[model samples]
Target: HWGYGKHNGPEHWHKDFPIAKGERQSPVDIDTHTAKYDPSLKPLSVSYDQATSLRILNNGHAFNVEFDDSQDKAVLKGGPLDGTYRLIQFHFHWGSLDGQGSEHTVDKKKYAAELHLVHWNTKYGDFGKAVQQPDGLAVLGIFLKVGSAKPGLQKVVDVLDSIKTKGKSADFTNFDPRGLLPESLDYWTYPGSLTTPPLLECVTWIVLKEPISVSSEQVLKFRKLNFNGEGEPEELMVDNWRPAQPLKNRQIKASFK
Candidate 1:
């Protein structure tokens, strides 16, 4: 019932999720002009074992690519992080229109969509424990523009047919998420929360400066998924993104000058 609709949209989220108005909330506008360059920030390190990908599922909000988090097979490090974060899963946020899909905006400019690769600090033992602490989660954000077709994205999209409805899942192995990232790893880092409910304020957000290209047709495929499960009233799953929250008393650090 807490879906993205008139009575259940972002505006109404605060009723159930009071932390939605917390200080460190995520998906803020990346005002490049105001972002400070930090010399201490190191180049982010991301290594993914090809076999780490486990499955893809539509979890009512969006489609997620679950990874094996039992070990450090797929980990993210460096770039304002003090410890290693293990890849747990990745997902996307989109809208009915290409101009309004992305949760975070660049200088107030919205992308066609946004991809979030979620990781958990290994020091916390597991995702369940990691998500509760202040520095337990790190999310890499990539903007998707409507341009050339991306083969990496195509690999994930190819599997969407089987998991078209909420709660639907299918085997999705041997997929490396590195192909989904842009050529440049330069990004903006800040303290923020998970953009979705239970909207925890435990994420260290790392948003890339460059965006990857995906054909408009590819984005439309995401809209075809249903928020409702099988044998229920079908509702097209679009605009499944929370609007950008206020960046209060926090600084956005850029890895690049």
Candidate 2:
């Protein structure tokens, strides 16, 4: 009730945020039955050099990364994806504790958190320009669960100790985001919109079925991020995820053989 105030929930999201009414609203519940498999849809091959210029941004609502277009290592290739798309940024959506917070759901079940890898079509010049096109963006969605501890995620949590306060983003150097990818590249994809406001309908959503796990402590560390400015103690910023939305007859394609 607190978050779902009248015209404040998913059902009314488009009404409150007109930009959300665009073609690409997110958090769409994935249903495999409705999917159309296309072998050409493949994971973008990413290397360390491509990730060197990754820049993290504190966007008030979430931490966003702006991929440096000048970085050739960060470019994606082949498939339905426009050639040479540049990686812009990546961020997470999590819950307060170990049990909740993912944006997308599976058979009505939500995971502990969700990670989004945002990219833009280089053909459109820049992110600002690409976003205006209906086919300008591609977002890879990774589900994070709480289970056995995952060392891979510790690198990200370690930095939280430094930027525990909101709006405090340090230049994270030598960070290889590819390490965070799920073991299996097999994914479900569809045409969708951004989960945030100004929901442009230009996103190609690739949601992985396999989830990466982290510990309860890691979840706590994430919750400690504060939206408040520096000098103020960090407050819990967990549960920042939006609930899942209707399928709206949209087809979700999977690459499972």
Candidate 3:
């Protein structure tokens, strides 16, 4: 029942979830020069079957496009993971302006938006079970910059008017997530956790070095999203991001030099 609010924000999360104070928390700043270049890191292997894309919905926290991963129809392999990590859902985080909303930053610099593709290791059988284990999840973090219009992004943006209120959902099948990714798979890897509550340290983050482009005009609608579900007082859903955590002895491995 926690959310990103004035009184119930990240600072007070430790009171409810003890793990909030734990090490290996996520949304860490990536300093490319300081990160170690690991020649062993494999090129990320990703594939998506549009048929597996089930639907898109406003989950209050963010709008997510859910997928049916009963099979390996969509998956993320290699990079920092072993075995298969099935894609489950993908969502976005944004702010009122360009260059200010991304959860993960680069060299202390921020991007306009960030996209999260959530996945669970097949070895765990399910996400709930996997979430409790350290090597349970592999989330792809993609940075989005303000640039020319992104034709692929328009599909998601077009539906915003219909799902304007929280708890709203729509059929979003046959859409490939690859459309939102940049050409380069070069990335940085780290051991971290979900940026939200319960904050389980189960994620192996793979953040792409290249960013996807989005015209500022395309995201004016997202910046107006409200955190509250239908029939609640209006609250703009801006700054739903957690601050970058302390590295605390963890090494960041870069796939590119």
Candidate 4:
């Protein structure tokens, strides 16, 4: 209810989340020519144990696949990080239409959707503590465009029907999100916030340059989800993306040309 709203949208967010206007806010426009190609940046290393994939739930905003991060069953390392980051969950953001949806843009171009694989640094005792520090979390952003159906994502979409109603959750396990990522790991790294309520500026964003494909039919299937539970007025869960914030003086680091 806080993101891009009538009174509580990004415009009025400063009223509640003071950090909303912070210099480190996220989802900025990525200009390739302006970005510096850092040869020193290490390649992204991600490893996941499908068994750690616990469940899937529609928390009104978007659907997320929760994981049991109590152990290092699934972990992400490398890519602008010196230590390992534990995989906690993954989610999606989209729009009411296909023209625009993604939070981050390349050369001012928007995509149909965006996927986030959220992880927290293991340096801190746990995710709860890590989420507050500046060098706490590392999120991987993958853009979704309208193309062909991806078999890798069907495991996630298959559960959407059961979780169509907000708060509805279904068992989603033994699935590796790594299978959904693009073949190329080329990415843009930056410091940014959560793009949501509280708007904490603790995420090390790793946005992939390659875009994944999703069919128009599959896109509509995800849009059918309700914002509220079945008892509430039918508000379709669409256009749930946050607007891109100002880049300010932060520099975008590219892992490729």
Candidate 5:
């Protein structure tokens, strides 16, 4: 099945993936003026070696990476985030072309793409169990802008050729996800729901204010993803992003200091 464009777009998502309609979606437009900014917040420290068990999986809709102590041996602590949450998966949302593809919009401006680092609270045991808890999940949002090249994301892009086939994934063993994080760890946070199906309202979102740069060529490479099933011929998977959602009385807080 074709994964994007025409009948494969967001409007037709539910028809193809049925469960998409029920998922708690993300990348909502953040009303900075209306949001209560809190600069006193601090970033949760995550160990580098503990962030290594990064396994990338291509699920047709998007590419997801599963993480954990078993996978990375890392722990998250301090700041608004208190308690141990294992990194579950990380994925990207992007546009078919340049100039779009971010989930969280600032003052109505959209970037080239957004990266989500997904984690689940360890208090509930594993990811499956944690998904049911109110504080079960945390997703860090990193915006990607098309500009000069970024060496930090080269590791991720290098593996693209391996997973070039739909539903196919390359082994990303011994890779540390921390390398993918932007230099600026400072972030804006808020309580919200998942951006996809099962739209659970138990997510604590942390969006980085400073966007990291990626080359136009890299951006174009991502656009080449095929949303079809594994056996199907490769097709362009561009514009794999959901439109910004309403804030709905949500308050966004930032940690600059």
Candidate 6:
């Protein structure tokens, strides 16, 4: 129902989801020049359990790689986080063409795509319950640049055909998401919200400074996916990203000098 069509796109999201105008809305334009370097900010710590990775599915918006978060086997700590945040799922946002799909921009420069690793604070009990609190969620934003094919990402791309339509899913196991991260954990931290509808402002955005590589052909394969399920109008699921929101009064703290 909340499709990214002409009538129901992000421009009209404010009508249905009032928080689209919220102060801490996500996918902000990261101005490196204005971002302050916080010497006190600690390095981000990431630990993922390959066994915890359950399945991958296309839920109309984007393909999500879900993880079993019943335990703290896979978690993120340090950086701007106070405690361990269990990995819940991870997904991506992209556009019809290369050069403009990433949600968070650095100096107004957009990437080919953006990956979001969603996590929930263990202290909050459950993800559903955690989403309602300000300090409940922590999301890692990793940009994808078009270049050589990334082997880590190729594993995901190879499975896109199995889930080419909305609501399609397959048993994806033993895949380590850690390989998707860049060598550098340097990042910019800020308070933001979920980039999609029900746009709750409960996320701590950790946008990584270094980007991972992907091939242009690999991204074209993703466009082959449909937002509409089988027997529907066959709409391609492209441009599934929210534009950069206002910075408002929030301060972006860099983990590196």
Report the C-alpha lDDT of model 6 over 169-215, residue by residue, as the tens digit: 99998888988999999999999999899999999999999999988
Worst 10 residues of 4 by lDDT: 1-10
lDDT preference between candidates 2 and 4, better one: 4
lDDT of 3 by residue, 1-257 (tens): 67787798888898999888788998899988899999988889997754378788887788999999898888999987999999999998887678688999999999988999999999999999999999999999999899898888888888877776688899988887878988899999999999888899999999999999998878787877777777899888777788888888799999998
Q: What residue runs in model 4 are displaced by over 4 Å at the alpha carbon?
A: 1-4, 49-51
Give candidate 5's error at residue 101 in angstroms.
0.7
lDDT, residue 163, model 1: 96
Residue 136, candidate 4: alpha-carbon lDDT: 94
How high is each candidate's TM-score? Answer: 0.98, 0.87, 0.97, 0.96, 0.87, 0.98
Candidate RMSDs in Å, in order, are 0.9, 3.1, 1.2, 1.3, 3.0, 0.9
Of 4 and 5, the candidate ahead on TM-score is 4
State the C-alpha lDDT per candidate. Answer: 0.92, 0.72, 0.88, 0.88, 0.73, 0.92
Indicate the residue-level lDDT of 53 in model 1: 91
Q: RMSD of candidate 2 to the true fold? A: 3.1
Q: What is the Å distance of residue 3 in model 4 from its true position?
A: 4.3
Runs in model 6 lying further than 4 Å from the true structure: 49-51
Between candidates 2 and 5, which one is better according to lDDT? 5
Q: Per-residue lDDT tens digits of candidate 4, residues 1-257?
A: 56445665678878888998899998899998999999999999888754378899998889989999888878888989879898899998898899888999999999999999999999897988887999899999999999899778988887898998878999987888877889899999999989887789999999999999998888888888888897888878888888889999899999998
Give per-residue lDDT, candidate 5, residue 211: 90
> lDDT score, residue 232, model 5?
81
Model 2: residues with Cα > 4 Å off, grouped in runs: 1-16, 40-44, 53-55, 231-235
